[PDB]
């Protein structure tokens, strides 16, 4: 993000779509778990 | 006066100079090898650079990235810090890595390299 401050990103899985649009792809963040949902365009 | 130290070591007492040094206005670099990237103690810094792979490599193992005089030196420079502090064990008691920050201009927290013989 910065000269600082890097982001450890890993990839874990990717779901199937759900009800606003969105696919869940969950990542591994700085080795926490985050779960983003995103438009299947 | 020092306003830039980097923490030469890693686990629990890199965060002691962290918050020691944090608490006095003085800015924390921290050190990381690969193997430390999910680590806390390099989220506990304002910066942090990893150490022990690269370009100027072959790869410093685990341990041997937190050793290595030359590498930690490096990214002292890299930042900026005018201080280290080596934390205990690793290299804190070299008298010869006292000599290489003797060599820079970067006050090695510890003392004069004639008490280390």
Redesign the interface.
């Known amino acids: 993000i910065e000269?600082?401050?890097?982001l450890?990103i890993v990839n874990q899985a990717v779901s199937a779509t759900d009800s606003q649009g969105m696919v869940t792809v969950f990542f591994e963040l700085?080795?926490q778990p985050r779960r983003i949902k995103v438009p299947d365009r | 006066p020092i306003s830039k130290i980097l923490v030469a070591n890693r686990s629990e007492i890199a965060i002691r100079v962290f918050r020691a040094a944090n608490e006095l206005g003085i800015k924390t670099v921290a050190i990381w090898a690969e193997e430390d990237?999910?680590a806390l103690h390099r989220?506990k810094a304002?910066?942090?650079?990893?150490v022990g792979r690269g370009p100027h490599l072959r790869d410093l193992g685990p341990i041997e990235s937190y050793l290595s005089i030359d590498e930690v030196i490096r990214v002292a420079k890299l930042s900026g810090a005018d201080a280290i502090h080596p934390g205990y064990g690793l290299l804190s008691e070299s008298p010869e890595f006292v000599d290489a920050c003797n060599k820079a201009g970067i006050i090695f927290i510890g003392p004069k390299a004639d008490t280390m013989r």
């Open positions: 000269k600082g401050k890097t450890v700085n080795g | 990237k999910l989220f304002d910066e942090s650079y990893q």
